[PDB]
């Protein structure tokens, strides 16, 4: 124990799609991360928002997080917070930073689809193929019940279709127009923006990193293969002990065939760029970024717990 991660302002971890603080009140979303940070002197709060919803609008995840932020401030006596989001959580964090600039000290996004996901486009394209539209309704009803049952508080505010739509590349472009940020580069440039933003007397430190385990390889007329760089080829035990490893490799192959380039299974390198990009070299798939499942990762993957701990220290040294 020490003060290595003792930031001035409390850290709030913000989960993405399907998330909650504890799956079924048992499995921590941010596996072993809250415990690690607290041990190093950090004050950390884990948000519990709708696993399936849009970020904007009444009852959206953005208004839920804003309300949680104010509750943490009142309880801590703190005046600002440091937001750290994973996946869609990064978009929710941007929402709070935009509507309540004075309550935010920094925004860090990990594997966040700032420009949307080619995979969401794919799933949405599939649904639209049913001429009767029944597929959408049935699947929606099933995913929605799933969210209520896995939510640690059995939150009934779930809308799988809104969530899907929010993650498409077309919708993300509109979100960016509605909630602009100095941390974003020009649409379609695959570039980041500025390292900070001054939102009316309030300065925010902006950071981001992405995992690029899935890399495109050779190809034929219309077929691009991929390789999972986080693992030792075929015999890595992570292929066996963590079911998400191969699952993201597969999802990642669909991504590459949709022109995404380097990705973590669901988010491309270009889509995740935001603020000061600390790294896009991590050999991680989407769940490795949050030390899942149960702390398993390929033999070539960096330690996500260490990375996050180091960032809490960088925040301390930066003055937040
Ligand atoms: Ca993993």
Question: Do residues 21 and 15 lie in contact, with contact meaning Cβ atoms separated by under 8 Å?
Answer: yes
Active-site choice (159, 228, 236, 264): 264
- Residue 77, Cα to own-chain centre: how many angstroms? 28
Which domains does the chain carry?
1-320 (3.40.50.1820)
> Does the active-site annotation cover 189?
no
Active-site choice (50, 87, 106, 208): 87
Query: Is 13 annotated in some ligand binding site?
Result: no
For residue 62, give the nearest of 32, 92, 90 by alpha carbon: 92
Query: Is 288 annotated in some ligand binding site?
Result: yes
Query: Is 17 annotated in some ligand binding site?
Result: yes
Q: Cα of 289 to ligand 1 centre, how many Å?
A: 8
Residues 6+ apart with CB under 8 A from 311: 84, 108, 207, 278
Dihedral through CA 89, CA 188, CA 163, CA 73, nearest 10? 30
Q: Cα of 6 to ligand 1 centre, how many Å?
A: 28
194 DSSP 8-state letter: -
Question: Do residues 210 and 272 lie in contact, with contact meaning Cβ atoms separated by under 8 Å?
Answer: yes
Q: Cα of 102 to ligand 1 centre, how many Å?
A: 36
**What's the sign of the alpha-carbon dihedral 256, 258, 259, 265?**
negative
d(CA 174, CA 16): 19
d(CA 181, CA 184): 6
Tokens standing for residue 36: 């690690």
Find the helix or strand (DSSP H, E) in which 104 lies.
Answer: strand 104-110
d(CA 227, CA 217): 7
Strands 44-46 and 104-110: unpaired
> Is the bond leading into 190 cis (omega within 30 degrees of zero)?
no
What 3-state class would DSSP assign to 40? Answer: coil
Q: Cα of 63 to ligand 1 centre, how many Å?
A: 31
> Does the active-site annotation cover 2?
no
**What's the sign of the alpha-carbon dihedral 264, 267, 268, 274?**
negative
d(CA 15, CA 111): 11
> Does the active-site annotation cover 56?
no
Residues 6+ apart with CB under 8 A from 49: 14, 15, 19, 20, 61, 64, 65, 68, 92
Tokens standing for residue 219: 């190809």
**What's the sign of the alpha-carbon dihedral 252, 257, 261, 266?**
negative
Find the helix or strand (DSSP H, E) in which 166 lies.
Answer: helix 160-166
Question: Do residues 81 and 73 lie in contact, with contact meaning Cβ atoms separated by under 8 Å?
Answer: yes
């Amino acid at each position: 124990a020490d003060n290595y991660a003792a930031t001035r302002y409390p850290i709030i971890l913000v989960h993405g799609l399907t998330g909650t603080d504890k799956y079924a009140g048992v499995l921590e979303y941010w596996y072993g991360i809250q415990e690690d940070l607290q041990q190093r002197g950090a004050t950390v709060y884990v948000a519990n928002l709708s696993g399936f919803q849009s970020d904007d609008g009444p009852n959206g995840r953005g208004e839920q997080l804003l309300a949680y932020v104010k509750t943490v401030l009142a309880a801590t006596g703190a005046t600002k917070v440091n937001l750290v989001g994973h996946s869609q959580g990064g978009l929710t964090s941007r929402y709070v930073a935009a509507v309540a600039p004075d309550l935010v000290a920094s925004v860090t996004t990990i594997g966040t689809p700032h420009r949307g996901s080619e995979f969401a486009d794919f799933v949405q394209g599939v649904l639209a193929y049913d001429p009767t539209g029944l597929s959408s309704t049935v699947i929606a009803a099933f995913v929605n019940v799933f969210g209520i049952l896995t939510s640690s508080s059995n939150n009934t505010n779930q809308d799988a279709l809104a969530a899907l739509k929010t993650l498409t590349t077309a919708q993300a472009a509109t979100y960016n127009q509605n909630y602009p940020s100095a941390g974003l580069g020009a649409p379609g440039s695959c570039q980041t923006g500025a390292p900070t933003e001054t939102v009316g007397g309030n300065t925010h430190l902006l950071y981001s990193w992405a995992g690029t385990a899935i890399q495109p390889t050779i190809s034929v007329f219309g077929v691009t293969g991929a390789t999972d760089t986080s693992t030792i080829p075929l015999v890595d035990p992570a292929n066996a002990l963590d079911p998400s490893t191969l699952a993201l490799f597969g999802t990642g192959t669909v991504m590459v065939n949709r022109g995404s380039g380097q990705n973590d299974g669901v988010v491309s390198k270009c889509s995740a760029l935001y603020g000061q990009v600390l790294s896009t070299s991590y050999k991680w798939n989407h769940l490795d970024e949050i030390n899942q499942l149960l702390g398993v990762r390929g033999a070539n993957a960096e330690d996500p717990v260490a990375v996050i701990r180091t960032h809490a220290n960088r925040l301390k040294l930066a003055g937040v």
